[PDB]
Curated annotation (Swiss-Prot), chain A:
It is linked to Tessadori-Bicknell-Van Haaften neurodevelopmental syndrome 1: An autosomal dominant disorder with onset in infancy, characterized by poor overall growth, microcephaly, hypotonia, profound global developmental delay, impaired intellectual development, poor or absent speech, and characteristic dysmorphic facial features, including hypertelorism and abnormal nose. Other variable neurologic and systemic features may also occur. Tessadori-Bicknell-Van Haaften neurodevelopmental syndrome 2: An autosomal dominant disorder characterized by poor overall growth, microcephaly, hypotonia, profound global developmental delay, impaired intellectual development, absent speech, and characteristic dysmorphic facial features, including hypertelorism, abnormal nose, and wide mouth. It comes from Homo sapiens. The gene is H4C1. This is Histone H4. Acetylated as part of spermatogenesis progression prior to histone-to-protamine exchange. The modification N6-crotonyllysine is found at residues 2, 5. The modification N6-butyryllysine is found at residues 2, 5. The modification N6-(2-hydroxyisobutyryl)lysine is found at residues 2, 5.
Curated annotation (Swiss-Prot), chains B, C:
Residues 1-101 form the Bromo domain. Residues 77-79 are annotated as: Histone H4K5ac H4K8ac and histone H4K5bu H4K8bu binding. The gene is BRD9. The chain holds residues 138 to 238 of 597 of the full protein. Binds acetylated histones H3 and H4. Binds butyrylated histone H4. Component of the multiprotein chromatin-remodeling subcomplex SWI/SNF called GBAF, which includes at least BICRA or BICRAL (mutually exclusive), BRD9, SS18, the core BAF subunits, SMARCA2/BRM, SMARCA4/BRG1/BAF190A, ACTL6A/BAF53, SMARCC1/BAF155, and SMARCD1/BAF60A. Interacts (via N-terminal bromodomain) with acetylated RAD54. Interacts (via C-terminus) with RAD51. It is found in: Nucleus. Plays a role in chromatin remodeling and regulation of transcription. Acts as a chromatin reader that recognizes and binds acylated histones: binds histones that are acetylated and/or butyrylated. Component of SWI/SNF chromatin remodeling subcomplex GBAF that carries out key enzymatic activities, changing chromatin structure by altering DNA-histone contacts within a nucleosome in an ATP-dependent manner. Also orchestrates the RAD51-RAD54 complex formation and thereby plays a role in homologous recombination (HR). This is Bromodomain-containing protein 9. The Bromo domain mediates interaction with histones that have acetylated lysine residues at specific positions. Also recognizes and binds histones that are butyrylated. It comes from the Eukaryota. The record marks 32, 85 as: Histone H4K5ac H4K8ac and histone H4K5bu H4K8bu binding. It comes from Homo sapiens (Human).
Length: 6, 101, 101
C-alpha cells in the first residue's frame, strides 16, 4: 500500500 | 477540560473527518513505510495530537496548527506526489488552515 | 551465437558485477514495490536483457545501451533520491555508459 521498496 | 481544549477538540474532529480512511489516525511504522523513521525526523498524527490536547500541551491555536502542518509536511515529504497519500496531505493542509481561519 | 552476442554478453556480465545485491537481476513486482506498474510503463532488468540477447533482439550496441538506460531511468524515477536503489541506479548508469564507450 505505502512507500517504495525495502 | 479547559476552553482551549474544547476549541482544539472541535478543530481536530473536523480535520479527521477530512481523512475518512484514517491514513492520518495513527503513527506510521517503518514496517508499512520502509525507511520512514530515517526520512521523517518528527512524526505527528491525529492520535498524537489528541493526546497533546488532553495533556494540556497546546496553549494556543497557533501551536496546534503547527503540529497539523508538520503532519501534512511529513506526508508530502515521504510520499511520492502521485500517491493517494501526498494528494490527501496537500488537500487537507490547505483546507484545514482555511477552516481554522 | 553471433559476434554481437558475445559482445553484448560481455558487457552484460560486466554491468551485473556492478550490482552485487542483484537489485537489477529480475522484474520488479508491485508486491515488493507498491504502485510500480502504474508508474513505470516499460519495465526492464538484467534478466530480460539477457533474454533479448539470446532472442537476437539487439542488432547494435546502441539498442543494448538504450535498454540499460531504460533500466537505470526507471529506478531513478520510482525510487526516492536517498535510497540505495536510486544511488546505485545513478552510479551504474554513468559508469556503464563510460564502460561501453
Amino acid at each position: 500500500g505505502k512507500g517504495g521498496k525495502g | 477540560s479547559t476552553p482551549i481544549q474544547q476549541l482544539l477538540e472541535h478543530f481536530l474532529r473536523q480535520l479527521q473527518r477530512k481523512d475518512p480512511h484514517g491514513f492520518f489516525a495513527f503513527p506510521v511504522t517503518d514496517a508499512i513505510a520502509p525507511g520512514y523513521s530515517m526520512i521523517i525526523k518528527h512524526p505527528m498524527d491525529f492520535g498524537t495530537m489528541k493526546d497533546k490536547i488532553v495533556a494540556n500541551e497546546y496553549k494556543s491555536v497557533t501551536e496546534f496548527k503547527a503540529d497539523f502542518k508538520l503532519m501534512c509536511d511529513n506526508a508530502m515529504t515521504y510520499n511520492r506526489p502521485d500517491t493517494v497519500y501526498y494528494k490527501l496531505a496537500k488537500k487537507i493542509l490547505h483546507a484545514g488552515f482555511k477552516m481554522m481561519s
